[model samples]
Target chain A: SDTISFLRGVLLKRYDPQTKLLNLGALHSDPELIQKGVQSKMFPAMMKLASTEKSLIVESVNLADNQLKDISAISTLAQTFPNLKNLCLANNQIFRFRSLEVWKNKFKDLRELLMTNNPITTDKLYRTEMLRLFPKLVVLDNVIVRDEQKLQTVYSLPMKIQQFFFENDALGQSSTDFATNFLNLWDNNREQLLNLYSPQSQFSVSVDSTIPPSTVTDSDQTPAFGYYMSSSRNISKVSSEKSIQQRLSIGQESINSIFKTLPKTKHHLQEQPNEYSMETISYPQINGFVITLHGFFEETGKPELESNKKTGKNNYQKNRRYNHGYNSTSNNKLSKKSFDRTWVIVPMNNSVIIASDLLTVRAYSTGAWKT
Target chain B: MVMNDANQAQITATFTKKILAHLDDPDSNKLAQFVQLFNPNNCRIIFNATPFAQATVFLQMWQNQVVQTQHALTGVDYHAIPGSGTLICNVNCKVRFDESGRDKMGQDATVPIQMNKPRPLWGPYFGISLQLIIDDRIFRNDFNGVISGFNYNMVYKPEDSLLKI
Candidate 1:
């Protein structure tokens, strides 16, 4: 009954599902453990808690403030939480590299670790040996030790890549000229680019708020979609018939108003041509062609028409309802953004008229074309 | 097919999930079910930008050579091209390999005999960006002659793994 009661007590006190942490720090100083004469049975007690509460999803473990010269006693912690992401061993007596050999090839998901106030910090090869042990460890004692970007490139897919996919060479050259000229006007003078969109044109934007994992090179951790979220026609997110219909700008006048509300942009096509990918296909229903582009662009400035106008109190309330009052600089950060744009172009009078323009904005990440 | 937007979305989601499930399935006998979904005559299969002329060739190589996989869908978005009779699906998913040092048949190369043991030491997950051009006929529950193009690319991968790629 004593052992069972102790195990039950530890399970109730140590495991925290909100933070996904299992606190086992300073075990030697635990009053109940010392009173019950189970101080040496720390690992077994932890194992019991892990097994009894198998539903608990723990990603972090705190083993700090413990008097441990080596992890030999508590080594079973590895078997308990093999995929631990963050581990804290601060203020411990771990002094030698060999003391950590028991954890080799374990903790494959260990990303951040803290072992400060330990004697091992004095060793010159301390950081090197830890990296060797934990290949995925990125942070040690609050300092990033590995180059995550370079490490990602090392594991990149080993396959050939192509920058463009065109049905034929003629379509390729034609699409290239169109994109080059269209981007130039769209970047420098968007007001004059309205001619490209006829009265029958349709345009809308969708924001994919999902951020790429750190494994993706140069992935944006904090992405701001304040400017695009108000008018986002993302079916998965904004699910209202009226909201969806109102966001789709159909005519020249409607498209121009929407364009004025979007940020000024710069596309580095000529200088950094490899950063973009293009695919062209024939749309027989319209006797035109569809050009789909996947690339990144930098937001240069704010919208031409001021979005934060307070001339009418009622108008301000209406804008606030949808915009969520995020027009401020704090919420709308200017940074590079990735996008997928599909344009339906109909050829007429030796030129092309844009029939449909669908833009999908997402957080910036390394292009898949970079093999 | 005249389908509502909500209904089309549910169908596409199910179709995409089925495709991913087939990729992660370990049973080689189910390869017939997987192959029947793609257009038999002409279908473009691109893996990491490497083109595969036939779906059968790709499936055979995947079944025999590649290790067992576990995939989880992260993002899915589709656009129906007006008058094209096809929809382009942009999908983001994560895949991890079985790094248990065993073959697909659960046989360890170092051991001569088939030993009864637990296998499949999963490695870290790698990100994948896949695009599919499918005929709208899939909305009508007609999977055959649906997938016209399949482009699968590994966008990101982890540093620690036994597998080369």
Candidate 2:
């Protein structure tokens, strides 16, 4: 019934005195009728009206299916309509996207172009090539989703799609659900979620009072247990067990909450653990865990162990034996004393709580946390 | 330095003989080389407003007209125009065709299926004029006419006897 009405409307509008410019945008009803209109010179009439009207919006008209294969008809419209601006031909059966090149130099004043839903699956280089051709284009919606490589290719181009609304199918998620989940994840880990969110975390340091002043050296500046506070200067003094426990409890709660609200990660934990025999897990809710794990194990700890172990002795024993031999041989008193301090170096647990009440406050202040 | 009429006739005859000899060369390149000899600038071709300078124009016109006719006969819609430096002329002619024929004098004088009613044919014929300007002082003009289904033939030649005052 809608098709019939649309056909009737098209026919009536063809002769309608009031309707000056006929917009068959996004309408793919009857190919035969469209062909008939084109053959009967009705399309040129519409183009003429568009020229005279000074403003026209034609969208999603499937002229491709109607035997109007050549882009000359669109070119004719472009030539006629000097003041015409918005043109949307999204989701039409056009095999060659480059056929629209005829309208490239012609639509000098065009502002909005709706090419979403078109099956223009181009590689990164091809999409950038299109951008280079249409430098003045302001809006390109529902066309092609830009992958990382494609974004890099067109990074220098001025014709970036200002308002990009990638369709649900392209993103592999429903629009509403994706938006909600994305925002939630963003708020939870605003500081560390680099790829998906913004606003990174601030780093701070705190010293422990239990450690003797004599033992404290410039090199002994290790991270101590403290809650991640918003004010870096208010680094909780780790003077007593009570303060450390309080800070740890607060930090743990914040971390736990971040992990809880994070989207249930669809990506599975790594089937093969690293050489450290540690399994890699994805916490879509937690922002920095995966990256932090990689930095700790693969980059720092694993490489250090691998290099040291190749010499056939554990790194600690090798270092001790070398230091003992050097201290005995070296007559330099200062260097010997330095070596003695190195031997006295008792390995302390370097792990520290990264989350804190202060972090919670910062997250809440930045509207990164909903609850 | 004015030459007597008799001497002038001899010079013109000698020049015409040379031109004819160059024109009769089997290789077009050799003929073009002879044409270059008349170019004052010493380049293969000159863009002056002389009959010889218009040779490029005439060639372009000839090609364009032929292409347009072929397109029309094949029911293909193609539009092309002669480039600059080409000479072009257009002429229109009228023709009539008889449609009525009878098998016998007593039979009805109805038109045959193949022959329709008599109609007048009217179409334009194109004539192209080319002028060869050799140097600043000497030049010659030639004309050619072209019609559908007919070969282009030379229509006119300049009078060699005419002398400038």
Candidate 3:
């Protein structure tokens, strides 16, 4: 009854009690248990059922050291799964990625392959070898270092695809041959390579002739070679234009809708006293008089009469409180004193007449203007 | 255009004469005066389409260690067009050493002088030919029929009198 109950529990859990994907680590740690689990009729049925799914992750597995070292299981899995698009075998001990030859051919739906931290040395020959093996593989990590020329070569070599990630290497140190070769490659094969990596933020190659002879150190004068990883493929085309516009429109619409739903409220301007006081008179008469005073003030503040006096601070202040009574009463009496300080009176009207009078006065009195 | 060409040739000859006369003077004071006569703004020396001043500075910096002493030309050629104001002349110069104290030509040395080649007793003879276009007054000077050339011969003298070459 206990054995029967365990089998039922296994069935309820879809024959994978741990719900773990086919990890190489499980086989490496306990081969007997994994082999027994795989041999079970229920395990095969569960795998077949899971194979129909679109995504799967298998990680941290030392499949390289396993008894099924030739990737027969991988080929079987690919053959069984039609919807599998993504496969992540991250941090595994798979020496050469060529072992995925069966999967490469069989898994037509496979779009992603994450093989990081594998024993892959970054060399030209090694990279070329890997490229031939994984022709459709869009990303490569822990592979050979690529200079500009090598990258260009990679782009042109039928893998006219996107996104190349070079880990822990400076792209600029590549030799002039590498730079020129790569630039020439990119320039000629831009269409193929454009989708492969994002446009570099500061991708610049020195125009060989423009380099000042003085600045060229002997070491730099002679060329040196190196590698680069291009990550241009990860850029999504849909995120660039229409999606951005849609996002902006959604944002604006939400803001507008929020404002529209807000309740309206009354707005009022507080009252202040005008020059004429309403407290001294009846309300209606006071209002009428105040309105008259307001009209007068508005008319007097108009541009035509205010322009000249308002332009200068001294003139504006002088006009603020005019001594009209003194000017009118003491006109003749203050004439001599005003005449003594006649130079200070700026002539606002008849400048020609003032100029001629000043000339006559200057001719009569020597050095008066100079003094 | 032909008249302008004639005027330019005349100017070139005049400037060349002035430079030669200035160089012929052996007095240090006159030499200093001649050096001072070189206008930094107006003059340009070209070596094989390269600006002479820039090329010379580059060579000096490049061979700074090998050469025992350094002597550089102060002035260069100046060219003026009728309508286009002034034109810069590109110059080409070749540096050669006179090991036997004779003006013998040799192949150009690779940058970072190779010690494997025959060492010269005296230092190298560096020269620059300046082509110029100046006003007509330049011809009146004593520089008539003289070829454009600048020469500085570096001689090494060891401080230790006991040591023999």
Candidate 4:
């Protein structure tokens, strides 16, 4: 491919599978090329270079001093070097935080990363945020990402987690009160929870099944989650279902089915206060408040579980199409599980109506809040 | 680490106006004032992905010949770079060329861009996407808001402008 041929033209390009090193110091870094106007290149073709014969078999890569702007094409680096441990991106022109997103889940066992001269390196929250995004990144910008920095950040897929903006005292208090009331109502009585929704309400769960490339030991116990799989809106990499219908549930009736269909949880919101973290902000788009809660809960005995155990049947009843998987993790005694729920609630007459509820469930791990 | 609504609004307003003025300001008159928006020691301007120059040299070319234009800002989205006391913005605008103005290429709408050879200068309406990094203390009395990096990409260009060629 022309990309492979083009990548071979840069001075910053080097590869030594013998020593497990690839150096891309500056291939296109020339006065003539700059005059020809190739300095602000996107390097879209460079990503395909990994597909070439001898490119992928390396451990360390040094891509420095390339006046390239959009390095997103290199996010394919993870796919290229599955065993890659060290990467150096010194002296580049990457300027945005959003640009770092493409690199998410791209590196596993990545022990060292170098981004010295880039503008993003100077960001106030860059280290913690980057550390959060790449849990396995032991060193960043030549400095070891210290343990203190990882305290309040999660090792999850980084998306939009903008800092909260509080309007007035009342706004914060009302949303806080609403979450407490709603969660209590949900935990104790699922039937009465229907009144909390507006005429048109929505709820859906997305399973982020792609476990982050963390060096920390994570349980591979994915006990067949086919019950909610049909309704999961997490269609990012999912191909089984199509359209919005497969994931989204509309109105009170549809939402009620989902509330009952999903796994039953007993959240210790009161006892384990520090186990949860909540951020409340005014969402001007919906003319309401958006409160996001991150916490864990215990999976207590539900009706299906009790019956499934009593009947000793591997298969569910004919009437009920599916049931939550009863593995050792979700069996016997109470099992702890972590979850994130975002509610777009509209306040009406001292009460709140949930316009939208998006829930993301993942495997259990020590959350950022506890750390 | 965070900016208040009032502070954000004020900073955003000045940034939009300052940038728009820099684009439309006459080359001969507001040249020095426009250059103040950049870091004298370290700054780069990537124009149309072809001409790459230092911020000062780029400003010189802008005031001289690279581009003679008028711009209308359509959208402005910026974010605070976490620990860094700076802001990065994705600015979108529509630009119309000035046919009478000559560039370093000694070309205009009627004339050709003779690169030591003669070719007619192109005229077109352009949709410019600007990625700019600037100092965060833009609202401060003394801060000129240094632009460390500027990536100007002509995302959309019309086939014909006021001058069809």
On residues A23-97, what C-alpha lDDT tens digit does candidate 2 reach at each position?
A: 464334546567645333545655555444443344222232243444555667655654445665555656665
Rounded to one decimal, what is candidate 2's iRMSD? 47.2
Ten-residue region with minimum lDDT total, candidate 2 chain A: A336-345
lDDT string, candidate 1, B1-165, tens digits: 222356567677778888898888888787899888888987777776456789888988776657788998755666565556766677767788876544465543321232856755687766666667788888887777778777776544444564444
On DockQ, the candidate that comes out on top is 1
User: Compared with the real two-chain complex, what DockQ does model 1 have?
Assistant: 0.18
Clashing pairs for model 1 are: none
Compare candidates 1 and 2 on DockQ and give the better one.
1
Candidate 1 local lDDT, A75-185, one digit each (tens): 777767667799888887766656578887778677888878888788887756765577666678887666664444233334456667766899878998999898888
Rank candidates, TM-score, best first. 1, 4, 2, 3
Q: Candidate 2 lDDT, tens digit per residue, B1-165?
A: 111123222333333334434433323334344433432322122111112224444333322211111101000000011111111111111111111111111222122345963332212221111112122122233312111011111111111101000
- Identify the runs in model 3 with alpha carbons over 4 angstroms from their true place: A1-24, A27-46, A52-68, A90-99, A120-123, A129-136, A142-371, B1-165
| Tens-digit lDDT track of model 4 for B1-165 | 233333454466566657777667654765777777777775555554333446766666565533456776554444443344655454556666643223433432221223464432333444444555567667575545367656565432232232221
Error of 4 at A168 (Å): 3.9
Off by over 4 Å in 4: A1-167, A212-226, A241-244, A303-334, B1-165
Question: Which structure among the candidates has the greatest lDDT?
Answer: 1
- Winner on TM-score (2 vs 4): 4
lDDT of 3: 0.27
